[PDB]
């Protein structure tokens, strides 16, 4: 009976709320109150990557920390050599409305998708010498919002149709579908071990998924608006989400609740991207306001600002060795900061 | 050799310059409308599980790419942001005196959106023949859904479009005034609304868009060539 099930849902919600409030014996802020402040950290633009005709929507670092792919909505991916600013590759896309791109951890493939509802895999190591579309994964009924490689053969995607998916690239069909979100899934982050991944999905909730079983381990709430960005903490036991309510928020999987919130009264614009430094002490968040902010993830005070983009900061990413952070903006530039 | 890599980068950049020329000289339009609007027929008259459709046509040797969302959910507040750089939004609305208020709200949201706040809207008050028939029949009254229409009278400067009843003229100009009031309520001038009374049969539609794009681009040139 519908009303009976509603009562049961409310009772279970209250039970979960009480269970997670009982564990809130302290706060991250209180426990970190005695830790030495990070101080004001200043980052300078070491490189500016020019060549995209339109706004950049996504970028991803290679695992070697030197090559990085960026997607722009002129319908083009560019593989840059960040050390020299050389354009290693330029891949024209069939659909110009790309909203995400990914770099395979082996470096053999890139992935990209968008309003076409398709995730195209491009092979970077063709014997012909040219980059080719190895596969194009169809089956999402909404625009492709994010995609991350688990492996040369497995890719996890999210879409505006409210579902995530795990694909078998060789067969090109959905090995698993992850359902439970009620809004557009705006981002996903893969855990370091690639056994779990979190997703933020335009319903003010983040969800933790186990790829092998294929269902939601946990649901985290506390954001007041759509979540645009989500990133896993380096040790994999926590993650950070940025939302349209102009705040970042750090959740802990084991405590199953919010641990911290990064917000300042002068910031009244949405957050487009988030990332952690290698140690996890710095949380770098890009904003609809044209500059990124670097937060002390332990004390949640603004440790610095990356200003220098003339438009919306759309994408943000730290290298695997932590040497630099790339920020790509709607002004069609990527800037490497150090 | 690093020099060979730099030479490859330079060749990539040359190709990118060619693509930049082609990209700059082509005009991109976003076609929006509800189910009842005849935007599909407008697309079908522009000739010469996918989430987006492109129709590329040409007028006086200038190329237009018009994009219409396909398989998407009705929550548009995220993918609409992808179109903050198009030259115009062709917003098609059915004159069905009732979905008119829903269309007005759609137009208002498109108009006041932060990322679409500099995009001009070409407004097609589509299906004018149906509006004329519905007004002449007299069975449905606009006052039921827009009581302010009880006080409305056609402005003197309004074009008569001869052969047209005063009643249908009053109705159509009130409907146009609703959208124009929404568009002028902003008080910024960053972008303009270009209303048109159209029917999907209209062969003039393409030309209309062209004549509107000429204006929109002109407004950009005024700023790009230091004339304002």
């Amino acid at each position: 009976e519908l009303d009976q099930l509603r009562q049961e849902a409310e009772q279970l919600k209250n039970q979960i709320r009480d269970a997670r409030k009982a564990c809130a014996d302290a706060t991250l802020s209180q426990i970190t109150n005695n830790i030495d402040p990070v101080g004001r950290i200043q980052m300078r633009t070491r490189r500016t990557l020019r060549g995209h005709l339109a706004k950049i929507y996504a970028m991803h670092w290679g695992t070697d920390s030197r090559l990085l792919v960026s997607a722009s909505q002129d319908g083009k991916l560019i593989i840059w050599d960040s050390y020299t600013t050389n354009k290693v590759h330029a891949i024209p896309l069939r659909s110009s409305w790309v909203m995400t791109c990914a770099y395979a951890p082996s470096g053999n493939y890139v992935a990209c998708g968008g309003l076409d509802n398709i995730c195209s895999i491009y092979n970077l190591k063709t014997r012909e010498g040219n980059v080719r579309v190895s596969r194009e994964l169809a089956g999402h009924t909404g625009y492709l919002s994010c995609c991350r490689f688990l492996d040369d053969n497995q890719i996890v995607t999210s879409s505006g149709d409210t579902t995530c998916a795990l694909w078998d690239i060789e067969t090109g069909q959905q090995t698993t579908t992850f359902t439970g979100h009620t809004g557009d899934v705006m981002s996903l982050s893969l855990a370091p071990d690639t056994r779990l991944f979190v997703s933020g999905a335009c319903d003010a909730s983040a969800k933790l998924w186990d790829v092998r079983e294929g269902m939601c381990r946990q649901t985290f709430t506390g954001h007041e608006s759509d979540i645009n960005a989500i990133c896993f903490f380096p040790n994999g036991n926590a993650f950070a989400t940025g939302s349209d309510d102009a705040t970042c928020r750090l959740f802990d999987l084991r405590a199953d609740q919010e641990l911290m919130t990064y917000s300042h009264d002068n910031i009244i614009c949405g957050i487009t991207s988030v990332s952690f430094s290698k140690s996890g002490r710095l949380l770098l968040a890009g904003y609809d306001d044209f500059n990124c902010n670097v937060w002390d993830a332990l004390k949640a005070d603004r440790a610095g600002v990356l200003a220098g983009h003339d438009n919306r900061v759309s994408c943000l990413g730290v290298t695997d060795d932590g040497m630099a952070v790339a920020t790509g903006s709607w002004d069609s530039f990527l800037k490497i900061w150090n | 050799e690093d020099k060979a890599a730099v030479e490859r980068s330079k060749m990539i950049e040359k190709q990118l310059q060619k693509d930049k020329q082609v990209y700059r000289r082509t005009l991109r339009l976003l076609l929006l409308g509800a189910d009842n609007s005849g935007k599909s027929t407008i697309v079908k008259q522009m000739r010469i599980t996918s989430g987006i459709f492109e129709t590329k046509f040409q007028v006086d040797k200038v190329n237009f790419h018009m994009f219409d969302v396909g398989a998407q959910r009705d929550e548009r507040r995220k993918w609409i942001q992808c179109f903050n750089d198009v030259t115009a939004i062709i917003f098609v609305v059915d004159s069905s005196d009732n979905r008119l208020q829903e269309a007005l709200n759609d137009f208002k949201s498109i108009w006041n959106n932060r990322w679409l706040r500099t995009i001009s809207v070409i407004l097609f008050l589509n299906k004018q023949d149906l509006l004329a028939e519905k007004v002449l029949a007299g069975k449905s009254k606009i006052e039921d859904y827009f009581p302010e229409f009880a006080r409305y009278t056609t402005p003197e400067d309004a074009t008569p479009e001869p052969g047209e009843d005063p009643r249908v003229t009053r109705a159509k100009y009130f409907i146009r005034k609703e959208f124009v009031d929404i568009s002028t309520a902003s008080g910024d001038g960053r972008h303009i609304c270009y209303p048109h009374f159209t029917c999907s049969v209209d062969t003039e539609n393409a030309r209309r868009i062209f004549n509107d794009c000429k204006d929109i681009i002109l407004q950009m040139n005024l700023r790009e060539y230091n004339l304002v």
Partner: nanobody, 128 residues
Framework: QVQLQESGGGLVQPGGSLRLSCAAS????????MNWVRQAPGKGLEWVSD????????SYTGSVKGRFTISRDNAKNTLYLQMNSLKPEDTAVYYC?????????????????????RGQGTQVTVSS
């Protein structure tokens, strides 16, 4: 947890009066422009009215103008719809929606596919 709880409603005689209320929790009520939406039997959701952050700007649909009046109490985190002269056409489930974002002027909140920031709604029935 962002949640909106509508209360008030039930059966009312034609030409009567009825006050709908919504209690809002899980977000700062002041920053968001609020809306009243409704769904009539065998029909889609239709926007009824909206009120800005501070209550200075208000808007109604034509079929409701003059009859209903929208209000908000930021201190109490409440949204009110005082309806007068009810009609049989007003029989519908009334939901309280809000803006997806905390300072925008626009809305995208009448969608059927489970808009995340509206309540369950309350039934309002008008019949003699």
């Amino acid at each position: 947890q962002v949640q909106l709880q509508e209360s008030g409603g039930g059966l009312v005689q034609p030409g009567g009066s009825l006050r709908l209320s919504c209690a809002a929790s899980g977000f700062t009520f002041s920053n968001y422009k609020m809306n009243w939406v409704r769904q009539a039997p065998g029909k889609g959701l239709e926007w009824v009215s909206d009120i800005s952050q501070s209550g200075a700007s208000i808007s109604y649909t034509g079929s409701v103008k003059g009859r209903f009046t929208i209000s908000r109490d930021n201190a109490k985190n409440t949204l009110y719809l005082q309806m007068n002269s009810l009609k049989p056409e007003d029989t519908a489930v009334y939901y309280c929606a809000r803006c997806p974002a905390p300072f925008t002027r626009d809305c995208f909140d009448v969608t059927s596919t489970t808009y995340a920031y509206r309540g369950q709604g309350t039934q309002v029935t008008v019949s003699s």
